[PDB]
Structure 1
């Protein structure tokens, strides 16, 4: 069999030349259009939920923001583990998924258990969702 495919290919010398042009032109098109980056192919997957809380000690940030966020996040489907950071002034919450899952799925997933936790948050502190980027999106920096 392996021979026959080489035999009929001996024939059709014209088609194979064209099929090579449709392949060379189809390859020249993608060698450019395809995303080029020095970005070492990403790392890990998670949804970030940062809530700012000015002038508040780590402990108060915990009880007022980090606590209700994390604890209610324990029941969001797909969550392997949940990281809670209570810094003086800010509340960084990380929801880690099972590597491989769709990012937007995870984001559209965490959202349902962040909807019921919005009213529980203090006076005027909001729950900001992480950007549609990872820990490499930092492309261009500048200063005025």
Structure 2
């Protein structure tokens, strides 16, 4: 039984993400009722906190528990950051995996990644038992305003 906690902290050093988010997030999730191990990750601007619960622990209890503890902790976190609650499943829930390709060239990376994020990602999340439809790869269209310093 696992429940994820993903907090985003933009541009902040990996060591800063730890000292202000990850660490104070793992030490509080340890003393949570029925927590076996709490593995943590401090990436350059990302705080992944994995919480593993002991055997035979009600899945939707371990969830509604993390959330109540994630309240009294939402304060100890920097102003801007917000502790997001992970999806219902795990790495194992990766059932169906596919790729989008157009060999005619009429469509490209971005045209398809958007096709995923705003069409397939919704025509699929409406299916019961499907907790999430994660888009992988491709390119996200970005309005790049390039300033000329001169």
TM-score where L is the length of structure 2: 0.61
Structure ID, larger Rg: 1
User: Do residues 122 (structure 1) and 78 (structure 2) align?
Assistant: yes
> Equivalences for 1:37-56 in 2 at 5 Å?
45-56=1-12
User: Do residues 66 (structure 1) and 22 (structure 2) align?
Assistant: yes
In the aligned structure 2, how far is the partner of 1:121 from the partner of 1:142? 38
Secondary structure at the residue paired with 2:7? Answer: strand
Q: Which residue of 2 aligns with 1:100?
A: 56
Q: Which residue of 1 aligns with 2:33?
A: 77
Secondary structure at the residue paired with 1:80? Answer: strand
Secondary structure at the residue paired with 1:111? Answer: helix
More helix by share: 1
Q: CA RMSD in A?
A: 1.6
Q: Does the aligned pair in 1 maintain the 2:3–2:88 contact within 8 Å? A: no
Q: Structure 1: where are the runs of 5+ without partners?
A: 1-44
Q: How many residues align?
A: 100
User: Do residues 136 (structure 1) and 92 (structure 2) align?
Assistant: yes
Residue range with higher mean Cα deviation, 84-93 or 95-104: 95-104
In the aligned structure 1, how far is the partner of 2:9 from the partner of 2:80? 9
Q: Deviations over 1:69-93 (max 9, x none)?
A: 1111221101011111111110011
Secondary structure at the residue paired with 1:136? Answer: helix
TM-score where L is the length of structure 1: 0.63
Q: What is the CA distance between 1:104 and its match in structure 2?
A: 0.9
More strand by share: 2
